[PDB]
Amino acid sequence: DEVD
Amino acid sequence: DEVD
Amino acid sequence: SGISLDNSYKMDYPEMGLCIIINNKNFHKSTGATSRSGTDVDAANLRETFRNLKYEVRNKNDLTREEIVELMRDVSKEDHSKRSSFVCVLLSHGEEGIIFGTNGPVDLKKITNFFRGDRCRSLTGKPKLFIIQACRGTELDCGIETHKIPVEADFLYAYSTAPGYYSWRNSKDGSWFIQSLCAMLKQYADKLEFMHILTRVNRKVATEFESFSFDATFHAKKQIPCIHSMLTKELYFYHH
Amino acid sequence: SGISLDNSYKMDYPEMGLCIIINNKNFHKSTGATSRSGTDVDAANLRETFRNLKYEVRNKNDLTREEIVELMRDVSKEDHSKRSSFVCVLLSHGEEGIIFGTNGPVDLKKITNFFRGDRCRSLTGKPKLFIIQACRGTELDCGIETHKIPVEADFLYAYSTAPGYYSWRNSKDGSWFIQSLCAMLKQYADKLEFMHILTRVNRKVATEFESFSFDATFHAKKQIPCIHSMLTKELYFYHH
Ligand SMILES: [Cl-]
Ligand SMILES: [Cl-]
């Protein structure tokens, strides 16, 4: 999981 | 007619 | 029993819920905010409309920003266990992200935060509707000739106007948006899902209203409301 | 003929319309923006999904901000007379009101303004859908355990996340929002109105996803998408  |  | 679906909010609790109407017409002189002629027409229309939907309507007039925050805090601390939903209508001056108390602005986020899924536990999982007649800026539309859940889930913001834009109010008839919202609720609340009702409101405002002003800057302007939905289910005001 | 209703957009033009997919994965080193692992999964899913809806899909990869503006301008100058609708999907880094080109930010309003009712006349009165997987800020959701028309009318912004919040992307599976959107379109596009499809997307994202991170700050977080509708009619991807 990564944030944009 | 008036604006809020 | 047989096959069950859960695509729509449970709306058959003992009570539909509260409808809090904050009607700010008269503002402290020092704010420089004009009186909002026509807003009493809106407030009365809303009271009747939500009465017929079986909401417990509480009308509040001319609240300071401190009074708005206290009211919202107190309402959020009530036990809503037996209530299906929550509705708050804000009628006032505004800017983007901001609603005016009689003595100055309040952040909308401050008001709505009281009802977050983690902060109002008896409304967790229930629809929380904020209906807002207020400006969102100063743009004018010239028109064209033709297992956890998020704490922000289950909110819906029914904004009278597009982000960045003025919102229009007629001093005799009430605001374009609230006029149209009440009419569409009256006609369709026993037959359409809420987003589809609000879409009819969008069309009504967009097509049936245009400003008239002696000031060319403000004349012949248009408005489109904006539905901001973070709901997770369909919402019908009727049940069974 | 008999009684006619006009509550839904005409979607039986010769063509459904364009679906422009802007897939920004690799960013110029000087921006300091990370590569968006998983976005190719999104772009491929979207291509297939909108292909099955009979859109003319154009995929674009790794565009600069100048290239995005030029592409949008050029597309808005096409003759859309025979097309029912317009769809643009933006996959990138972002902030509130902002989408990243590979070399820096573009105002979302600059992109969408090309398609205003007064500026793209062959799309006037037709739905213009902007689907946006990008951050809208840096907030994290901790969750809780359970006759003219406006120039801004007929736009819909399907945002992956609530205003002010990060948006989540899995490097293997794609983004939570685009994953869910494609799945719900696949399952329901031949049977539900679009707002109801997007509501199912809201529920899917809200209930079925939660972040996993070795960093406690970013761990166990939730997301709710936000539907921003300025549409004036119901939208069904099927007709007849
Ligand atoms: Cl009045
Ligand atoms: Cl990828």
Instruction: Give the type of residue at C135.
Output: C
In this structure, how many other beta carbons lie within 10 angstroms of the beta carbon of residue D193? Answer: 19
- Residues D115, D39: Cα–Cα separation, whole Å: 26
Q: Which residues contact D80 (CB under 8 A, 6 or more apart)?
A: D17, D18, D86, D120, D122, D123, D126
Centre of ligand 1 to C-alpha C92, Å, is 12
Helical axes C39-52 vs C176-188, angle rounded to 10° = 20
CATH assignment at residue C163: 3.40.50.1460
User: Residue C202 has what DSSP assignment?
Assistant: H
Query: For the CA atoms of chain B, what is the radius of gyration?
Result: 4
- Does D142 qualify as catalytic in the annotation? no
- Among all bound ligands, the one having the nearest atom to the CA of A2 is 2
Q: Which residues contact C23 (CB under 8 A, 6 or more apart)?
A: C39, C40, C42, C43, C59, C60, C61, C62, C91
Alpha helices in C92-237 (DSSP H): 108-113, 176-188, 194-208
Centre of ligand 2 to C-alpha A4, Å, is 13
In this structure, how many other beta carbons lie within 10 angstroms of the beta carbon of residue C208? Answer: 12
Query: Which whole-number Å values give the CA distances from D45 to D39, D93, D102, in the listed order?
Result: 10, 19, 22
* Cα torsion angle, D226, D231, D232, D238, sign: negative
Cα three-residue angle C148-C153-C154, rounded to 5 degrees: 120
Method: X-ray
Element (H, E) at D49: helix D39-52
> Rounded to 5 degrees, what are φ and ψ at C149?
-120, 160
User: Residue D237 has what DSSP assignment?
Assistant: S
User: Residue C221 has what DSSP assignment?
Assistant: -
**Residue C164 region by backbone torsions, left for phi larger than 0, else alpha for psi between -120 and 50, else beta:** left
- Considering its fold, how many domains does chain C have in total? 1
Residue of chain A nearest D160, judged by CA positions: A4
Helical axes C194-208 vs D194-208, angle rounded to 10° = 130
Indicate yes or no: CB of A1 within 8 angstroms of CB of D211: yes
Burial class (CB in 10 A: 0-12, 13-18, 19+), D174: buried
Query: Which whole-number Å values give the CA distances from D44 to D8, D18, D38, D40, D41, in the listed order?
Result: 29, 16, 10, 6, 5
Query: What is the DSSP code string of C15-76?
Result: EEEEEEEEE-----GGGTPPP-TTHHHHHHHHHHHHHHTT-EEEEEES--HHHHHHHHHHHH
- Residues C38, D84: Cα–Cα separation, whole Å: 39
Experimental structure resolution, Å: 1.7
- Touch of C by A (3+ CB pairs closer than 8 Å): no
Instruction: Give the type of residue at C171.
Output: S
Instruction: Give the type of residue at D128.
Output: K
List the structure tokens of D126.
């037709």
* Cα torsion angle, C68, D230, C227, D89, sign: negative
Centre of ligand 2 to C-alpha C112, Å, is 37
- Residues D122, D82: Cα–Cα separation, whole Å: 8
Token pair 């060319």: residue: C216
Q: Which residues contact D59 (CB under 8 A, 6 or more apart)?
A: D21, D23, D43, D47
Identify any residues that bridge with D94 across adjacent strands, giving them in sequence order. D99
Query: For the CA atoms of chain A, what is the radius of gyration?
Result: 4
Q: Which of D188, D217, D212, D218 is nearest to D200 (CA)?
A: D188
- Where chain A is discontinuous (C–N > 2.5 Å), the residues before each break are none
Centre of ligand 2 to C-alpha D186, Å, is 21
Q: Which residues contact B2 (CB under 8 A, 6 or more apart)?
A: C34, C36, C37, C38, C168, C169, C170, C171
- Residues D108, D105: Cα–Cα separation, whole Å: 9
Q: Which of C88, C93, C120, C182 is catalytic?
A: C93
Centre of ligand 2 to C-alpha D47, Å, is 14
- Residues C101, D141: Cα–Cα separation, whole Å: 29
Indicate yes or no: CB of D141 within 8 angstroms of CB of C162: no
Identify any residues that bridge with C57 across adjacent strands, giving them in sequence order. C19
Burial class (CB in 10 A: 0-12, 13-18, 19+), C141: buried
List the structure tokens of D194.
């679009």
Question: Around ion ligand 1, which residues have CB less than 5 A away?
Answer: C 40
> What 3-state DSSP class applies to C176?
helix
What range defines the domain where residue C7 resides?
1-240
Of A1, A2, A4, Cβ closest to residue D134: A4
> What 3-state DSSP class applies to D184?
helix
CB-CB contact of D235 with D157 (8 Å): no
> Rounded to 5 degrees, what are φ and ψ at D204?
-60, -50
Indicate yes or no: CB of C146 within 8 angstroms of CB of D147: yes
Burial class (CB in 10 A: 0-12, 13-18, 19+), C4: exposed
List the structure tokens of B3.
């604006």
Q: Which residues contact C189 (CB under 8 A, 6 or more apart)?
A: C52, C53, C197, C237, C238
Cβ of residue C217 closer than 8 Å to a chain B Cβ: no
- Residues C221, C212: Cα–Cα separation, whole Å: 8
- Residues C73, C83: Cα–Cα separation, whole Å: 17
CB-CB contact of D201 with C227 (8 Å): no
Which residues of chain D are within 8 Å of residue A4 when distances are taken between CB atoms?
36, 92-94, 133-135, 160, 166-169, 175
* Cα torsion angle, D96, D100, D103, D105, sign: negative
Instruction: Give the type of residue at D73.
Output: R
Helical axes D39-52 vs D176-188, angle rounded to 10° = 20
CB-CB contact of C193 with D196 (8 Å): yes
Q: Across the A/D interface, how many CB contacts are shorter than 8 Å?
A: 35
In this structure, how many other beta carbons lie within 10 angstroms of the beta carbon of residue C54? Answer: 15
Helical axes D176-188 vs D194-208, angle rounded to 10° = 140
- Residues D103, D101: Cα–Cα separation, whole Å: 5
Helical axes C194-208 vs C176-188, angle rounded to 10° = 140
- Among all bound ligands, the one having the nearest atom to the CA of C42 is 1
- Among all bound ligands, the one having the nearest atom to the CA of C41 is 1
Residue of chain A nearest D171, judged by CA positions: A1
Q: Which of C132, C154, C159 is nearest to C228 (CA)?
A: C159
- Touch of B by D (3+ CB pairs closer than 8 Å): no
Residue of chain C nearest B3, judged by CA positions: C168
**Distance between D173 CA and the closest CA of chain A, angstroms:** 9
Which residues of chain C are within 8 Å of residue D148 when distances are taken between CB atoms?
143-146, 210, 220, 222
- Residues D108, D99: Cα–Cα separation, whole Å: 6
